[PDB]
Amino acid sequence: DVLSRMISEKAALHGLLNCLIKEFAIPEGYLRYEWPDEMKGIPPGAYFDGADWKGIPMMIGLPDQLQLFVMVDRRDTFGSQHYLSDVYLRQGDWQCPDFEPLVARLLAACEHIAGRKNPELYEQILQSQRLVSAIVSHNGRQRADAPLQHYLQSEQGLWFGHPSHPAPKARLWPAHLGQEQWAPEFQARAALHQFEVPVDGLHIGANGLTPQQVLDGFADQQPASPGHAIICMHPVQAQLFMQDARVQQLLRDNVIRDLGQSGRVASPTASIRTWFIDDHDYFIKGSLNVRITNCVRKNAWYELESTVLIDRLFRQLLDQHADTLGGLVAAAEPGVVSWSPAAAGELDSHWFREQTGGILRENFCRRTGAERSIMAGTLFARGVDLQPMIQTFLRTHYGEALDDNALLYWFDDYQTRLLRPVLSLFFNHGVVMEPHLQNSVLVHQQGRPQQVLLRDFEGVKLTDDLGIRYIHPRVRQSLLYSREQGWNRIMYCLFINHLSETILALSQGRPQLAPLMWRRVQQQLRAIQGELKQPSPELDALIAGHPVACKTNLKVRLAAASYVRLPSPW
Amino acid sequence: DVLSRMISEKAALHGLLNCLIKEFAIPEGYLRYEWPDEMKGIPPGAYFDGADWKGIPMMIGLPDQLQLFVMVDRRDTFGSQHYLSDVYLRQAGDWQCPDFEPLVARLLAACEHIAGRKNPELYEQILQSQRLVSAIVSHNGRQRADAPLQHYLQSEQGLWFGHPSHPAPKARLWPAHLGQEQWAPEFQARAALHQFEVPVDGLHIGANGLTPQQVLDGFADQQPASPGHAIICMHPVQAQLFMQDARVQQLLRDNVIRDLGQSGRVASPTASIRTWFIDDHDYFIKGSLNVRITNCVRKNAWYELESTVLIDRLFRQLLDQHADTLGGLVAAAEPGVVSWSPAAAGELDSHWFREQTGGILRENFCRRTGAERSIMAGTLFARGVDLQPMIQTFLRTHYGEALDDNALLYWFDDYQTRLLRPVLSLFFNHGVVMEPHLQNSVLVHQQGRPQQVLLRDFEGVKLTDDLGIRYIDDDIHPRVRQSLLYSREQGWNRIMYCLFINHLSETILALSQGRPQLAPLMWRRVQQQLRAIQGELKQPSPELDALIAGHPVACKTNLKVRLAAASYVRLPSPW
Ligand SMILES: Nc1ncnc2c1ncn2[C@@H]1O[C@H](COP(=O)(O)O)[C@@H](O)[C@H]1O
Numbered sequence A: 001d002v003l004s005r006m007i008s009e010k011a012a013l014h015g016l017l018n019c020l021i022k023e024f025a026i027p028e029g030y031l032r033y034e035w036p037d038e039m040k041g042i043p044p045g046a047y048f049d050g051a052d053w054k055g056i057p058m059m060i061g062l063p064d065q066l067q068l069f070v071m072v073d074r075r076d077t078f079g080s081q082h083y084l085s086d087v088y089l090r091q092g093d094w095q096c097p098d099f100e101p102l103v104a105r106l107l108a109a110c111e112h113i114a115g116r117k118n119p120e121l122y123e124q125i126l127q128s129q130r131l132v133s134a135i136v137s138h139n140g141r142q143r144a145d146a147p148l149q150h151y152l153q154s155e156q157g158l159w160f161g162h163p164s165h166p167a168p169k170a171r172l173w174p175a176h177l178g179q180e181q182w183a184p185e186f187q188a189r190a191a192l193h194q195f196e197v198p199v200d201g202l203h204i205g206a207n208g209l210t211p212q213q214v215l216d217g218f219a220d221q222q223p224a225s226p227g228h229a230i231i232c233m234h235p236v237q238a239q240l241f242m243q244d245a246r247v248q249q250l251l252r253d254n255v256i257r258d259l260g261q262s263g264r265v266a267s268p269t270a271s272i273r274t275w276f277i278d279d280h281d282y283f284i285k286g287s288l289n290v291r292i293t294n295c296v297r298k299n300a301w302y303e304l305e306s307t308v309l310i311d312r313l314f315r316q317l318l319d320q321h322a323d324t325l326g327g328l329v330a331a332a333e334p335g336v337v338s339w340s341p342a343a344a345g346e347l348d349s350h351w352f353r354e355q356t357g358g359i360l361r362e363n364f365c366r367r368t369g370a371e372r373s374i375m376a377g378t379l380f381a382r383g384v385d386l387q388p389m390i391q392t393f394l395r396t397h398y399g400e401a402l403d404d405n406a407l408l409y410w411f412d413d414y415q416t417r418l419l420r421p422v423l424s425l426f427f428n429h430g431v432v433m434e435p436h437l438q439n440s441v442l443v444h445q446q447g448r449p450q451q452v453l454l455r456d457f458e459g460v461k462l463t464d465d466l467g468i469r470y471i472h473p474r475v476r477q478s479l480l481y482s483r484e485q486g487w488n489r490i491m492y493c494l495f496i497n498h499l500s501e502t503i504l505a506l507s508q509g510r511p512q513l514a515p516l517m518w519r520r521v522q523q524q525l526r527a528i529q530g531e532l533k534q535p536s537p538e539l540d541a542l543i544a545g546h547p548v549a550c551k552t553n554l555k556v557r558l559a560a561a562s563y564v565r566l567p568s569p570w
Numbered sequence B: 001d002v003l004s005r006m007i008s009e010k011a012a013l014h015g016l017l018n019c020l021i022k023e024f025a026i027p028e029g030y031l032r033y034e035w036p037d038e039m040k041g042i043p044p045g046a047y048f049d050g051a052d053w054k055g056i057p058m059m060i061g062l063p064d065q066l067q068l069f070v071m072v073d074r075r076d077t078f079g080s081q082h083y084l085s086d087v088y089l090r091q092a093g094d095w096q097c098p099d100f101e102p103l104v105a106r107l108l109a110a111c112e113h114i115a116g117r118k119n120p121e122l123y124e125q126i127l128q129s130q131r132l133v134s135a136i137v138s139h140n141g142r143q144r145a146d147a148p149l150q151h152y153l154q155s156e157q158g159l160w161f162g163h164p165s166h167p168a169p170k171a172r173l174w175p176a177h178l179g180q181e182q183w184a185p186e187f188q189a190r191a192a193l194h195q196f197e198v199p200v201d202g203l204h205i206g207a208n209g210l211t212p213q214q215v216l217d218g219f220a221d222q223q224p225a226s227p228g229h230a231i232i233c234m235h236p237v238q239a240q241l242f243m244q245d246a247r248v249q250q251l252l253r254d255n256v257i258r259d260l261g262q263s264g265r266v267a268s269p270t271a272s273i274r275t276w277f278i279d280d281h282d283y284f285i286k287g288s289l290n291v292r293i294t295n296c297v298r299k300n301a302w303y304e305l306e307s308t309v310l311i312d313r314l315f316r317q318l319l320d321q322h323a324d325t326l327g328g329l330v331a332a333a334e335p336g337v338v339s340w341s342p343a344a345a346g347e348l349d350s351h352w353f354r355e356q357t358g359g360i361l362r363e364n365f366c367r368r369t370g371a372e373r374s375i376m377a378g379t380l381f382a383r384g385v386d387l388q389p390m391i392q393t394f395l396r397t398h399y400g401e402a403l404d405d406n407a408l409l410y411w412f413d414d415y416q417t418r419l420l421r422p423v424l425s426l427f428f429n430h431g432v433v434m435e436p437h438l439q440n441s442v443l444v445h446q447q448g449r450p451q452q453v454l455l456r457d458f459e460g461v462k463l464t465d466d467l468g469i470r471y472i473d474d475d476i477h478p479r480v481r482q483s484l485l486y487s488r489e490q491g492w493n494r495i496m497y498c499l500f501i502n503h504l505s506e507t508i509l510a511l512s513q514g515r516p517q518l519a520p521l522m523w524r525r526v527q528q529q530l531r532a533i534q535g536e537l538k539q540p541s542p543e544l545d546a547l548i549a550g551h552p553v554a555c556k557t558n559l560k561v562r563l564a565a566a567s568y569v570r571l572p573s574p575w
């Protein structure tokens, strides 16, 4: 309980330091691995364990006459390391300030470096940590590695959320309407909200499903009277929707009808607005007009059309270019539904469509099996005891302690399945996936990696030189990336977001494996380069040793910023 | 170096904390197992590891407004626990964690307030001892941490930290100029012993089973002596002191005695400093050392030299006729004893001459036991240069694998039985009071399985008034008998302190590191063992009954007795 608060404060803190080190200290030059010239105020027990130093001293100089001390377990160029001491600060004698005080000062430091302040961020960092405390407390009695035993529990078990983010669990629910009833981390379940709507205003996109079968995937249609159909949305989305005067106007005129929470019974997933239904053919991905992680997460009209277009393309690449796809497994997105009143104003129509918009994703579990499939973020995350959960999950599958050569063999299998499809798609066809931890699902046979399923069509882009060569101009704009923009994304998602976290969780207690795992990534890049059918200059530079693009989560909140570069592990 | 220093500050702090818990806090009721009501100043990392609390909160109210906080691994009646955090202090005021010197200063001041007396000399002795430890850890810090457990001399030499419940374990007050490294077993010191040539007519020789001449050659080669003279030998620092005296100078000028410098056997001091080991020699040499080491002056008193003879005669008789009543005792013999004084000196001068020159021979048990099968207990249960209990690695090696709970309980059981039976057998059956603390004990083991617990040191053997004193022939100097004579209760306090607080408590804390739930199981095995031994005693034991039924055990002090003008306290029973 106090324990739960204490667990949450260390987790949040570690998230905030990842950002400081990655976004600011490494790019700008503020980090050195050295001991302070004067340790006054730091207790012996923070850096001395009885026999030796607890790892390596880390110092961060900060323009404002501010210093930061922390012990770490490794040197890493991507800023991935286990922190082995509390954080200490000096302006003067060293201090160990409380959570909030520490956040306040560190954020302040980042605001000077940035030249801008953010009124809202501070309260978001604290909100996020107070949820995590509620979460740890609620979930603290289960076996620690239980999230990795079933697909759904892994969506529900990203306790700490994104691991390089200042406010991972920021969720700004409306005037009451609840928290815990909608949180995956609380095993949230609910009947989806339903409306009955005239068919003249429906928009349906579909691939190999009839417009009727697309509706059937969202709602049982039988209660619809003729000339009508049933749409569903997040109960929170439905209450905000029934708060516009344009929806009240329509409900009073009996153009649309409210059917309450009468829909399929579903569990939301780590993305909050995508719902899972055990043994149904589809996940449901709706719009939620709510600030999740600082951002309204919505299905814009042209994205509803993106999705269809993308789905059809992956199907066409598979049927004809399977062997230049590098072993690709992806969840399809076969249908898309929205509603707007007939002969509505262009602006009204945008807003109705965006509010009611929904996508169907293939429930890959029917195909992969729900007890073989783990969201990649939960796989490489830490349990309620703050240990990386991967460690014991391998232990019970392997049948004993894993030696160095079993971690390297396992890693090799894993990273091969991530890199081969991603890099095949970008250089052979100009398709840009987004393989961060939360768009990837490992499929595994008794623990041995089989495939890494990739999802999320919102995140798929097409390059102007290649991909786009496979419709409305605004949809086109949404889909299009330059070859450079796209390569930055693939650099960040694959190496910094994903495998950097993979190697860290596998290499706990054994930091010497880290460069061994990096050399092996470098050797896998080479073998895949020779397997490509098109020019790959960008991959040559990465293989050479050139800097790697990295997306930012703190910095983008301070400036009026987007990406930095970090030196390459090889 | 900086790492070595920190290892020593941690080690010394822990020893001093032991004293405070054992001699003030627990007996006077200043101790509670309880979180502060306010944590400000203490960092999260000091009590929280990421998942759970690093053990149990320990807290001490010190009458002078001062309070103390330290995380410990267990609750213990004797003050035996592993400390799992730095030490924190607060007045009236946030918590803080002072450096070693201030931390020692404020702890000292608090114990002094209780006592009403200050001892700044003990303060300097605390700092001085920590510094020698700093040097010791740095000199030895590269050998394998359990190397001191592989050979007998090594075991005498690798008591890196000394007495673990003492505020100044390594403090040794030689004249400032004679150095520390040259005489320290922790620096693998060796030396030729210092010799004088002396006329035979002032020798006072005690021998059991040996001729006078064999006793002499036990200390030195008598070959360089001229007719009617012998060669006695001596700690070279003691010869420095012995030669200060005007009486000695006067013999030197008159050529009655000659100074032969350091020309005797090269030998290696052992943990008691004044007792030398020679590899493959029949005997240890135990000399006087008129220097303050730890809590006493290490002279063989003139009357202790007479009594050694009688206790050795006595032990031989017991071991020979009364075997069945001795509980399996193994004890190092002390068969010869030499000293010199001028034949025409009076009592006072003769007594003083005899204490400067006093020598005791003790049997090199390693001739029976084997050098590689023998370990001083003190070290056996001590921390290596890494601050880990050396017995852990010692046992895992000899057992091939990691020892499970049972394995440790079994090993403990074979150990305490062989320590307890002899000691209690000697005290109840015969009234012979031994002093079985960690340094008066050697474990004879076979591939790590404990075989004998040999016991040593006749200087502190006493005989009870009701029983033990019966063994001595009533034509003995009154002073020699006064020295041997304990009351039954004086006798019982000592044994209780040595057996259970000094010894097994340490055995148990070492064996049971990282597994504190074995301590009560182990104290229970101890208790069943007392009941067993009792039904085997030939005489009554109303004190053993009191102990079994959970009455408080007697505890010797090492800080309190240094502050008082009080030598003992009572601690509550483990069971
Ligand atoms: N390692 C991760 N990388 C990216 N997003 C993550 C990660 N872990 C959790 N998430 C969350 O998953 C959601 C993805 O949202 P989006 O990418 O906008 O569809 C965001 O709320 C993220 O905060």
Ligand SMILES: Nc1ncnc2c1ncn2[C@@H]1O[C@H](COP(=O)(O)O)[C@@H](O)[C@H]1O
Residues within 6 Å of the ligand: B162, B163, B164, B169, B271, B272, B293, B294, B378, B437, B438, B439, B457, B502
């Ligand atoms: N645990 C211990 N108990 C008693 N003496 C010890 C202990 N550890 C080290 N020693 C040293 O062993 C020597 C024995 O002294 P004595 O009591 O005269 O035999 C003293 O110098 C002590 O400092």
